[PDB]
Amino acid sequence: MFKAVLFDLNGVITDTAEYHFRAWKALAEEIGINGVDRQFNEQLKGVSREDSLQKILDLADKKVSAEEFKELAKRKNDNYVKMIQDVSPADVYPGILQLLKDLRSNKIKIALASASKNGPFLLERMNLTGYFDAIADPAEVAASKPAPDIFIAAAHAVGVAPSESIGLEDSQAGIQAIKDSGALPIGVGRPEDLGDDIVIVPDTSHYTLEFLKEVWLQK
Ligand SMILES: O=P(O)(O)OC[C@H]1O[C@@H](O)[C@H](O)[C@@H](O)[C@@H]1O
Ligand code: ALF
Ligand SMILES: [Mg+2]
Ligand code: NA
């Protein structure tokens, strides 16, 4: 049986992938880059703040100064942080709170494997901090998603091997990070975005402990 579940945050625990998208698109258009649409944004999900900005600049073959790069990432983050101040427990995605309760009942460790430095603030907004056995600090890994380091760190943090873990993700970068960590991925979203080669569910109501067991047994 699996011994840990490693959670992405944005687009898995709550609908904050939408707010990252809207904030990055606003940032891009301010600097004359109009190509950040929903299709392009599939390449930004799971990617660090600085890597996201660089992918947007690269889309436009645009070069900025080191000073302007730092200011742009800070500008987007300040906008995003204002957007999330009113997040509340009512914004937890369907199934997620019950899953956390069921995992703890069954002595399955719970770790956050988020790239977001805003992760702890968001778990507090949603009254979820108490469910987590560990939060892997994304500033501490030497390599961000799609590198597996954050999932390895989340597992290490709860004393479980990646190979004994399930990872939950809504992104391309994060699915690759889980694969390379040794854990079993279960994606949430569209197969057209996340692929046809792992288990994908259409929405988070499907993330029940019953279903994670159903998937783990059929691995
Ligand atoms: O800018 P933050 O809050 O540190 O978030 C980093 C990344 O966190 C990931 O969880 C999101 O999918 C990305 O969209 C985001 O860029
Ligand atoms: F959406 Al994340 F780490 F929370 F990639
Ligand atoms: Mg995500
Ligand atoms: Na709170």
Gap between the Cα atoms of 153 and 148, Å rounded: 9
Location of structure tokens 């960590």: 181
Do 148 and 206 fall within a single domain?
yes
Do 173 and 79 fall within a single domain?
no
The Cβ-side half-sphere exposure at 191, using a 13 Å CA radius, reads 6
Q: Whose CA is nearest to atom 4 of ligand 2?
A: 9
Do 129 and 204 fall within a single domain?
yes
Edge-to-edge order in the sheet of strand 134-135: 134-135, 109-112, 4-7, 165-169, 184-188, 199-201
Q: Within 10 Å of residue 3's Cβ, how many Cβ atoms? A: 16
Number of domains present in the structure of the chain: 2
Do 128 and 199 fall within a single domain?
yes
Question: DSSP letter string over 132-200?
Answer: -SEE--TTTSSS-TTSSHHHHHHHHHHT--GGGEEEEESSHHHHHHHHHHTPEEEEES-HHHH-SSSEE
Ligand 2: atom nearest CA of 47 is 5
Structure tokens at 208: 């029940």
How far is the CA of 64 from the CAs of 34, 40, 92, 172, in angstroms? 16, 21, 37, 27
Do 70 and 145 fall within a single domain?
no
CATH code for position 161:
3.40.50.1000
Distance 176 CA to ligand 4 centre (A): 31
Residue 37's domain comprises 15-92
Contact 44, 97 (CB under 8 A): no
Do 125 and 181 fall within a single domain?
yes
Q: What's the farthest any 2 CA atoms get from each other in the chain?
A: 52
- Technique employed here was X-ray
Q: Within 10 Å of residue 107's Cβ, how many Cβ atoms? A: 7
Do 101 and 166 fall within a single domain?
yes
- Cα Rg of the chain (Å, integer): 17
Ligand 1: atom nearest CA of 10 is 10
Classify 118 in phi/psi space as left (phi over 0), alpha (psi -120 to 50) or beta.
alpha
Gap between the Cα atoms of 120 and 114, Å rounded: 10
Distance 27 CA to ligand 4 centre (A): 29
How far is the CA of 57 from the CAs of 34, 37, 65, 148, in angstroms? 11, 14, 12, 25
